[PDB]
Design an enzyme around this catalytic site. Sequence first.
Site, short mmCIF file in Angstrom:
data_model
loop_
_atom_site.label_atom_id
_atom_site.label_comp_id
_atom_site.label_asym_id
_atom_site.label_seq_id
_atom_site.Cartn_x
_atom_site.Cartn_y
_atom_site.Cartn_z
N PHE A 31 -8.30 -6.24 3.96
CA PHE A 31 -7.90 -4.88 4.18
C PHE A 31 -8.14 -4.02 2.96
CE2 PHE A 31 -4.86 -1.97 6.45
CZ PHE A 31 -4.64 -1.07 5.42
N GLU B 298 0.75 -1.22 0.00
CA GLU B 298 0.00 0.00 0.00
C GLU B 298 0.81 1.31 0.00
OE1 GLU B 298 -3.15 0.38 -0.36
OE2 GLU B 298 -4.01 -1.56 0.40
N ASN C 67 -8.62 -19.60 -9.72
CA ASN C 67 -9.92 -19.06 -9.45
C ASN C 67 -9.81 -17.58 -9.06
OD1 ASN C 67 -12.46 -18.46 -7.23
ND2 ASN C 67 -13.03 -19.64 -9.07
N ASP D 66 -6.80 6.91 -4.62
CA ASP D 66 -6.24 5.59 -4.80
C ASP D 66 -6.39 5.17 -6.26
OD1 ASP D 66 -8.91 5.10 -5.14
OD2 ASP D 66 -9.09 4.00 -3.26
N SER E 139 -13.47 -19.50 -4.43
CA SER E 139 -12.08 -19.67 -4.09
C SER E 139 -11.95 -19.82 -2.61
CB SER E 139 -11.14 -18.64 -4.70
OG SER E 139 -11.84 -17.40 -4.71
N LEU F 251 -8.39 4.52 3.58
CA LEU F 251 -9.48 5.13 2.82
C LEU F 251 -10.33 6.08 3.59
CD1 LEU F 251 -11.61 5.15 0.34
CD2 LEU F 251 -13.00 3.89 2.02
#
Length: 162
Positions: A104, A11, A132, A20, A117, A32
Amino acid sequence: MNIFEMLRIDEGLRLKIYKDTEGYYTIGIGHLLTKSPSLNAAKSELDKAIGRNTNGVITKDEAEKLFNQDVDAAVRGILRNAKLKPVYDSLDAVRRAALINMVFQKGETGVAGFTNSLRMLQQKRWDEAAVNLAKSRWYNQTPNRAKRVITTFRTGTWDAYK
Ligand SMILES: [Cl-]
């Protein structure tokens, strides 16, 4: 290597508000602020999160605080999600970090949605899961990161990050 280092890699760190990959107002370590298009709102939100009049800027320390709170939360949402819990519970440590990364980045809900998945991870079908997972908007919009995570899920190791 661990969660924090991992996410910190994925990040980055910015002391000033930014947009972002999706164009949303964010700060520090992938924190965020808002989906709204108002820089002001974003500012409000920040102040509120920081506990002061920031003016769009924060300290490293503050950034870090946000981060822990965020890692913390991610885990907890995981622990509280009836679909996530079991998976996570059945994973080894490295791989959990990966699930946490996704959570996250996209939300419990977001993640709660990779039913198949998730199922695959549960049965420990590494290769199948990786394929997947790759079929997703998520991979397609952030290929490099998705790759790291996926590799991670695949091998149970930190190589992607080494
Ligand atoms: Cl990427």
